[PDB]
Structure 1
Amino acid sequence: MEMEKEFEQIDKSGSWAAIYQDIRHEASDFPSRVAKLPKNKNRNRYRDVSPFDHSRIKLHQEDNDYINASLIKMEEAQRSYILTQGPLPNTVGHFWEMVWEQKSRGVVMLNRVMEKGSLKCAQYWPQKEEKEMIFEDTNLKLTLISEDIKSYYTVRQLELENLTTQETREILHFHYTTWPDFGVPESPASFLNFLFKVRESGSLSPEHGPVVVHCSAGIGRSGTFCLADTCLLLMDKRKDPSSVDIKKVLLEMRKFRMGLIQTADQLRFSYLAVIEGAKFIMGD
């Protein structure tokens, strides 16, 4: 069923809450035993948001390999994403270790450091060229190379140096800065523009490790980003773009990380973004 018609039918009936609860009821439940070990309590931002054991990212160290991060592998679309929480004061070094080990080219940030008067994630990147950051626990150095501030997002160029081998790589930081403190954006236009800027960079392409995506918990805004990208790619690949079922794509992604899309309003916004984005994908 053409999703644009499914959309108007849900909106006219006002059943968004009912569709959303059906997804929550059918979603996968897999063990998260490593996340719940007592040694890992200060590595989790939220007690109710954990990576599944089967899909968690492992840090390459014998001490403790744990980070709150999952690999979302979309077989038909041929795209992979790492979804992670906003880093904590004691996990900023683990975060950059993961970027290094997984060979990622891009980091996508969908939140502000402070929202609603509270801290949603650590200040994990340098704000001035001449004041670099050293992570002594993981032996990495991070330098700000350049910054491009636009109305809806900021793009930064950073140098990550493995202090053990003196190898260096260029990481691009894509920072969406205008998601509102409450609700979802009224139009998906600036979110779609942002997505196409990340695509243009090469950050989502198979020649690099998976993109790292985060918000505060790494399930809500983060879920919206990967769901929209995968649905638009499937609409370009298939003989019938009308066959793409956004609810079925979301349940596939929920096999790899719990809780993706946190509200009925985020589900409606995801539909709006895919419907409006398709009017480029189909030749405009």
Structure 2
Amino acid sequence: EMEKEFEQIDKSGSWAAIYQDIRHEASDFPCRVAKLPKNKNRNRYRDVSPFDHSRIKLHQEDNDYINASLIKMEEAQRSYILTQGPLPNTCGHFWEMVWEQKSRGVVMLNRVMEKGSLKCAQYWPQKEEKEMIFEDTNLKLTLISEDIKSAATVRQLELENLTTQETREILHFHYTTWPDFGVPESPASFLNFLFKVRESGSLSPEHGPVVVHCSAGIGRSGTFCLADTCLLLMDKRKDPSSVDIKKVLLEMRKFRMGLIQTADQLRFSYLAVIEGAKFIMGDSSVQDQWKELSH
């Protein structure tokens, strides 16, 4: 069981050693496009790059590069796009990717300002009457409505292709209480947010992959996607013991480097899957519990 391995690792203080073993065994694939000098200002961090084989290509012949990776989980049959927090010059690229990939939801796990620094550009409008037009990619973005709660904020956005005048509704899920290089306040808070994303239908295979980002698109984003995939794999087999989290994380790291950035984030993802398992196996009352101590 996950639970017995957790107790063994905790009793033996092995999380830092377990986590380093994952870093050592993780896939190493080339990132030549990301390292091209013409793409230097499209990367937020020089040590965070998408692999060539899984990177999302923009559908422009100018420069198709965005720091974004397609995580295609074959057995779980769920895909995610993990990307960095957009830069002041890549906000148009970001929404171009959302359009071209037909994404229904965007999951944001960071704040714009964290630890006195700007970890993400203000890539969505904060006021209904002040829409954003991204001239380089010819898209218009309008805040439709906003539902703010203690731990998370859900926004409805309208994305319009100004070339064709098509409009789409994008759901923006913003978890606002997850420190950079840290963990959420509780598993219950994290799981309450995750199931809000699930219930929205944004993860449905009828849509394009959900776009998930933090500042770099690996740390908090990797924790979020690992827990969702492990809970989904449990769901398909209705069998918690068939899910090996370390192997799932290593499978995900074939598609983007550095997913989950600290040993405590790995420990928390165990906690989230173990606690979320109670819902997957048929105890739906655990959901209102999460909302009850999500306050």
- For Structure 1 versus Structure 2, the TM-score category normalised by the shorter chain is over 0.9
Unpaired runs of 5+ residues, structure 1, are none
Is contact 2:181-2:262 (8 Å) kept? no
Is contact 2:238-2:281 (8 Å) kept? no
Q: Deviations over 1:165-208 (max 9, x none)?
A: 00000000000001135632352101100000000011000010
Is contact 2:104-2:169 (8 Å) kept? yes
Is contact 2:146-2:155 (8 Å) kept? yes
Deviation at 1:243, TM superposition (A): 1.6
- Taking structure 1 as the reference length, what is the TM-score of the superposition? 0.98
Deviation at 1:222, TM superposition (A): 0.1
Is contact 2:110-2:179 (8 Å) kept? no
Provide runs of 4+ in structure 1 moved above 3 Å: none
CA–CA distance in structure 2, aligned partners of residues 106 and 274 of structure 1? 22
- SS of residue paired to 2:34: helix
Deviation at 1:237, TM superposition (A): 1.1
CA–CA distance in structure 1, aligned partners of residues 205 and 79 of structure 2? 8
Q: Deviations over 1:202-254 (max 9, x none)?
A: 10000100000000000000001110000001111115321210000000000
CA–CA distance in structure 1, aligned partners of residues 160 and 218 of structure 2? 29
Tell me the residue number matched to 1:71. Answer: 70
Tell me the residue number matched to 2:93. Answer: 94
CA–CA distance in structure 2, aligned partners of residues 156 and 106 of structure 1? 10
Q: Deviations over 1:102-132 (max 9, x none)?
A: 0000000000000111100000000111110
Is contact 2:34-2:67 (8 Å) kept? yes
- SS of residue paired to 1:35: coil
Tell me the residue number matched to 2:36. Answer: 37
CA gap 1:239/1:152 in 2 versus in 1, 3 angstroms: closer
**Cα root mean square deviation, aligned:** 0.9
- SS of residue paired to 2:178: coil
Tell me the residue number matched to 2:113. Answer: 114
CA–CA distance in structure 2, aligned partners of residues 239 and 200 of structure 1? 19
- SS of residue paired to 1:130: coil
CA gap 1:69/1:181 in 2 versus in 1, 3 angstroms: closer
CA–CA distance in structure 2, aligned partners of residues 243 and 50 of structure 1? 32
- SS of residue paired to 2:160: strand
CA gap 1:158/1:239 in 2 versus in 1, 3 angstroms: closer
Percent identity of equivalent pairs: 99
CA–CA distance in structure 2, aligned partners of residues 172 and 14 of structure 1? 40
- SS of residue paired to 1:172: strand
Total equivalences in the alignment: 282
Q: Deviations over 1:29-78 (max 9, x none)?
A: 11000000000000000000000000000000111000000000011111
Deviation at 1:16, TM superposition (A): 0.4
CA–CA distance in structure 2, aligned partners of residues 22 and 160 of structure 1? 42
Is contact 2:180-2:220 (8 Å) kept? no
- Taking structure 2 as the reference length, what is the TM-score of the superposition? 0.94
Tell me the residue number matched to 1:226. Answer: 225
Is contact 2:86-2:120 (8 Å) kept? yes
Q: Deviations over 1:234-277 (max 9, x none)?
A: 11111532121000000000000000010101100000000000
